[PDB]
Amino acid sequence: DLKAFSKHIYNAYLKNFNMTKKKARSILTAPFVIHDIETLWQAEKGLVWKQLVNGLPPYKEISVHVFYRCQCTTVETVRELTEFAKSIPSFSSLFLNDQVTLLKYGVHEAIFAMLASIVNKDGLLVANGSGFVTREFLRSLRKPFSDIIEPKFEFAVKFNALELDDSDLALFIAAIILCGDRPGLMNVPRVEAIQDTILRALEFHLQANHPDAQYLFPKLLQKMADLRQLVTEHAQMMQRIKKTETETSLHPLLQEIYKDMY
């Protein structure tokens, strides 16, 4: 039951996410360092990116260009999360409208949790591990673009202190997506039931994987609550950008995610 449950989730996680925390940590211990405008330019000229630069919206400025690259990665991680979720039998058993509801309100929490895997206190990996953008450079962007980034590093460094591996994260992320609290859900009892099974699997798994860790399971439950507050603040900053940065393009999928959030 729960052992094979977890194992199926773990394989779904390995199957659908290109960058795993294992791969990321090895690199973070070399990548081209982006820390100013010149190295950013060189990086765009020199590094392979998943989305091609001319494919981005028309250029406006440096801070906005960075934002577009963040937005590109966000949308790509949504696609991965969707296929990850669909690789879970109980998720695909849900009516398609409930699937969309869970992803809509779940993906950003899952993204910011997984983000910690490619983050340290000095910056984060970009371009599939080919580059490393410094936290200080991201801090130097003009508001509101620098403001929307720093809160994630703060969460990330604290989160990495728990020292989860990929197998723990697969269950953690599954639990975030299969959440019975999401607005507009049709079959709440069914999602609550799946959520409960995942959380049992998570505890079972952590007992085995981290036998000497103390209070880790309730600590992770608190991280789930923390991520909700993080995403609320994020959505508020995105609404601010929408209203005060009219020249900045917003990806339509992300726009569909944000119109009913406060």
Ligand X SMILES: CCCCCCCO[C@@H]1O[C@H](CO)[C@@H](O)[C@H](O)[C@H]1O
Ligand Y SMILES: O=C(O)CCCCCOc1ccccc1CN(C(=O)c1ccc(-c2cccc(F)c2)cc1)C1CC1
| 95, 121, 163, 232: which one binds ligand X (CB under 6 A) | 95
Choose from ligand X, ligand Y, none: what does 34 bind? Cβ within 5-8 Å by kind: ligand Y
Choose from ligand Y, ligand X, none: what does 152 bind? Cβ within 5-8 Å by kind: ligand Y
Residue partners of 164: CB distance under 8 A and separation at least 6: 21, 172
Choose from ligand X, ligand Y, none: what does 148 bind? Cβ within 5-8 Å by kind: ligand Y
User: How many Å apart are CA 128 and CA 122, to the nearest integer?
Assistant: 18
| 70, 72, 75, 100: which one binds ligand X (CB under 6 A) | 100
Least CB distance from residue 112 to ligand X, whole Å?
22
| 11, 92, 93, 97: which one binds ligand X (CB under 6 A) | 97
Residues 4-43 vs ligand X: string with x where CB under 6 A?
----------------------------------------
Please identify which residue in the block is written with the tokens 């009913």: 260
Q: Are 253 and 77 in contact (CB under 8 A)?
A: no
255 binds ligand X (CB under 6 A): no
Single out the segment in contact with ligand X by CB under 6 A; choices: 91-99, 142-150, 164-172, 235-243: 91-99
Choose from ligand X, ligand Y, none: what does 95 bind? Cβ within 5-8 Å by kind: ligand X
Least CB distance from residue 89 to ligand Y, whole Å?
27
Nearest to 108 by CA among 75, 135, 85: 75
On the 0-12 / 13-18 / 19+ scale of CB atoms within 10 A, 15 is exposed
On the 0-12 / 13-18 / 19+ scale of CB atoms within 10 A, 67 is buried
| Token digits of residue 176 | 């975030």
**For residues 87, 89, 91 and 95, what is the CA-based torsion angle, rounded to 10 degrees?**
120
Which residues are at the interface with ligand X (CB under 6 A)? 95-97, 100-101, 184
